[PDB]
Amino acid sequence: SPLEPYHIYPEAKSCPVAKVGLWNGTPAHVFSGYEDVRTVLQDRRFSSDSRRPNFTELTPTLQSQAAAPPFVRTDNPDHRRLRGTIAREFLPKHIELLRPAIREIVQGVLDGLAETAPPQDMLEAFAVPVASATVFRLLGIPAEDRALLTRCVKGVVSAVGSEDEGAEVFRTLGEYIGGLVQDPSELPEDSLIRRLVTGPYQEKQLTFHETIGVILMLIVGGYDTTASTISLSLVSYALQPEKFSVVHEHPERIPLLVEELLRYHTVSQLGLGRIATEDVEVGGVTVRAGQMVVAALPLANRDESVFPNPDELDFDRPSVPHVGFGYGPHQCVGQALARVELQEAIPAVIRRLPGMRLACALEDLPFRHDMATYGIHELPMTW
Numbered sequence: 182s183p184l185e186p187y188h189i190y191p192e193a194k195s196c197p198v199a200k201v202g203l204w205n206g207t208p209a210h211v212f213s214g215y216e217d218v219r220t221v222l223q224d225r226r227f228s229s230d231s232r233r234p235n236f237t238e239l240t241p242t243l244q245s246q247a248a249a250p251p252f253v254r255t256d257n258p259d260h261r262r263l264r265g266t267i268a269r270e271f272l273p274k275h276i277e278l279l280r281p282a283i284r285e286i287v288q289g290v291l292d293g294l295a296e297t298a299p300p301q302d303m304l305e306a307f308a309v310p311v312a313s314a315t316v317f318r319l320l321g322i323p324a325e326d327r328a329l330l331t332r333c334v335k336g337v338v339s340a341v342g343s344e345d346e347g348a349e350v351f352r353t354l355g356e357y358i359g360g361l362v363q364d365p366s367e368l369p370e371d372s373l374i375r376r377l378v379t380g381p382y383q384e385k386q387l388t389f390h391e392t393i394g395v396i397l398m399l400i401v402g403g404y405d406t407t408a409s410t411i412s413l414s415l416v417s418y419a420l421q422p423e424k425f426s427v428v429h430e431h432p433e434r435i436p437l438l439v440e441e442l443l444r445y446h447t448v449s450q451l452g453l454g455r456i457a458t459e460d461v462e463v464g465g466v467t468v469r470a471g472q473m474v475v476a477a478l479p480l481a482n483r484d485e486s487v488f489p490n491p492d493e494l495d496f497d498r499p500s501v502p503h504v505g506f507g508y509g510p511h512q513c514v515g516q517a518l519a520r521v522e523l524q525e526a527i528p529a530v531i532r533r534l535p536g537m538r539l540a541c542a543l544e545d546l547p548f549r550h551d552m553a554t555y556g557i558h559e560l561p562m563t564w
């Protein structure tokens with residue numbers, strides 16, 4: 182069943198706190214309860230510092246960066262400092278100002294397809310163009326460089342690439358970003374990368390390589406999950422288009438509809454790894470100092486004690502906040518941007534192409550079982 186997340190940590194079907202083996206055999210406790218997952222993610226005893234002995238990334242590719250990771254794998258003081266360099270960019274009030282530009286990106290992509298015959302791969306023809314243009318323009322990345330970055334991101338997010346293969350993709354990506362930090366003069370004045378490089382970095386608030394790290398995370402984080410969420414949401418539309426009547430009849434409920442999609446399609450499918458810094462009791466288990474845990478976001482998001490009939494996509498749910506963007510100090514810095522993109526893209530394409538249906542059988546879609554984040558590798562649609 183590809184629209185349910187239960188195949189990832191099958192041990193969790195039996196225990197809300199399940200002992201499992203990670204990619205390299207390292208033991209971990211997987212927490213699948215909503216309240217437990219929030220507890221873990223907000224507790225200072227569960228570290229994100231990949232420099233700690235035994236810290237295990239959930240893929241080998243990411244393991245390659247554990248000795249010098251970007252800020253997602255730090256605790257304070259570095260975490261606060263490094264996130265602080267770009268935090269202001271991502272405040273909802275600032276991101277809201279980009280809504281008109283985002284709406285025009287969406288419109289332009291749809292206009293581009295207006296005379297194109299189906300079937301179309303809506304990942305490559307819609308979701309990726311929207312999401313990648315949105316972030317790459319925010320960042321200031323030259324149009325000519327975007328294909329390379331796209332290839333690098335795929336490598337970074339692979340759950341099948343080896344640790345050595347991962348090290349190589351990160352080198353390529355890091356060398357590219359480094360060139361921009363050294364010489365940002367061709368980048369637009371109104372760009373996040375130029376502001377970072379001529380602001381905090383010029384003011385010596387973080388190093389050259391830390392600057393690379395911050396930019397790297399925004400490229401890796403900045404469109405792939407958004408594009409995948411758009412795509413999965415279009416699978417949901419194709420299967421049950423009547424549920425999306427909200428888009429037409431009650432447009433004020435679109436933000437809520439987007440939240441339910443983020444709950445249902447928790448694309449951070451492996452959950453979030455943490456390491457205990459001391460012995461900690463949570464959810465009736467004692468996690469020992471130096472041992473790994475996983476906060477299983479997709480499962481927390483289908484905890485029936487919080488979300489009744491959790492396997493149903495239901496846009497009339499009582500509103501409870503999901504944990505699709507994580508929780509606590511690392512909670513997705515990009516979440517406001519993702520939300521604006523989803524709110525603008527999904528309704529627009531449904532309005533333009535309300536007859537959208539899968540062009541192939543659901544079982545023939547290539548789901549992203551081989552990536553750190555879920556979605557589909559291609560989404561053939563007809564109308």
Ligand code: HEM
Nearest residue numbers: 252253398402403406407410449506507511513514515519
């Ligand atoms: C639907 C879209 C997205 C999902 C589901 C998503 C999910 C996540 C999650 C679960 C985390 C927390 C990781 C942890 O605690 O270890 C995170 C962190 C992050 N997200 Fe996102 N994200 C999305 C969109 C974006 C976008 C659009 C950007 C940037 C433009 C971005 C940038 C980041 C960054 C930099 C972090 C690191 C934050 C930190 O460690 O303090 N994300 N995201």
Ligand SMILES: CN1C(=O)[C@](O)(Cc2ccccc2)N(C)C(=O)[C@@H]1Cc1c[nH]c2cccc([N+](=O)[O-])c12
Nearest residue numbers: 243246250251253254338397398401402449553554
């Ligand atoms: C790949 N990825 C993910 O897609 C993500 O699902 C979402 C995300 C993306 C970017 C930033 C934050 C969150 N989550 C939850 C992740 O933890 C890792 C990030 C990561 C983890 N360890 C890393 C080491 C080096 C570089 C990166 N990187 O982001 O470039 C990482």
